Nucleic acid binder design. Structure first.
Length: 71
DNA sequence: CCCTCTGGACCTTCC
DNA sequence: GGAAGGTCCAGAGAGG
């Protein structure tokens, strides 16, 4: 079962969590409040501050298709 | 000694 | 429109 695609937002939240952990390895992390602030941040980002992540998504999009052609 | 699932907010992909 | 299925997850149950 090939993993499902990961949107730019999925990549962004993963990255926000990697970035948050490294500087605060003491991290509580509440499902509801981590989600809210990641998406509150995604709003204040620009079409190309986001680009870094859509690229990661376009890549993982190609990955899915490639694994998909064998399952 | 060492994968899967569940709750749920939020977002994009897909029907 | 809105379901499906991603991201964030600790702890428990299932199994090597």
């Amino acid at each position: 079962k090939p993993r499902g695609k990961m949107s730019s937002y999925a990549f962004f939240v993963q990255t926000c969590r990697e970035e948050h952990k490294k500087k605060h390895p003491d991290a509580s992390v509440n499902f509801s409040e981590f989600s809210k602030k990641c998406s509150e941040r995604w709003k204040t980002m620009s079409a190309k501050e986001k680009g870094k992540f859509e690229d990661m998504a376009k890549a993982d999009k190609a990955r899915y298709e490639r694994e998909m052609k064998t399952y």
